[PDB]
Amino acid sequence: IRENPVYEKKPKKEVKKKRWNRPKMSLAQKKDRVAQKKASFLRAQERAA
RNA sequence: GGGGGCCGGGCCACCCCUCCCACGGCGCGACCGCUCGGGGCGGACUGUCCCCAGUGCGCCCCGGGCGGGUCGCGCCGUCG
């Protein structure tokens, strides 16, 4: 340590961008999801009745 | 006493040609910024119609409606 304390930064290696976590859902998707849920609910009672 | 005046010049009045600028309108042309649809590819997600049905996103062409943006072009109007 007392001889060579200088830090040598790790050789930076470029890598292609990769997404590991889910992005935020869009309002249009959220509005559609509620619309789908309601429509499935009404059909569910329709088939049951 | 009362008058006309005395020679050139410049501008305007009229005719023809006619440059620039400003302002308004009408059209076009191209940038730039918005917007509603058609298709192609990828990618993600949703729904108790599920080998079913959707919804964003990235990207790729085509079409359409505009901005009281910007520039350029032409025409019209101004006792400019």
UniProtKB/Swiss-Prot annotation:
Coiled coil: none annotated. Residues 12-22 have a biased composition (Basic residues). Signal peptide: none annotated. Residues 7-49 are annotated as: Disordered. Component of the large ribosomal subunit (LSU). Part of the 5S RNP complex, which is a LSU subcomplex composed of the 5S RNA, RPL5 and RPL11. Component of a hexameric 5S RNP precursor complex, composed of 5S RNA, RRS1, RPF2/BXDC1, RPL5, RPL11 and HEATR3; this complex acts as a precursor for ribosome assembly. Interacts with isoform 1 of NVL in an ATP-dependent manner. Interacts with RRP1B. Interacts with IPO5, IPO7 and KPNB1; these interactions may be involved in RPL5 nuclear import for the assembly of ribosomal subunits. Component of the ribosome, a large ribonucleoprotein complex responsible for the synthesis of proteins in the cell. The small ribosomal subunit (SSU) binds messenger RNAs (mRNAs) and translates the encoded message by selecting cognate aminoacyl-transfer RNA (tRNA) molecules. The large subunit (LSU) contains the ribosomal catalytic site termed the peptidyl transferase center (PTC), which catalyzes the formation of peptide bonds, thereby polymerizing the amino acids delivered by tRNAs into a polypeptide chain. This is Large ribosomal subunit protein uL18. The gene is RPL5. The chain holds residues 247 to 295 of 297 of the full protein.
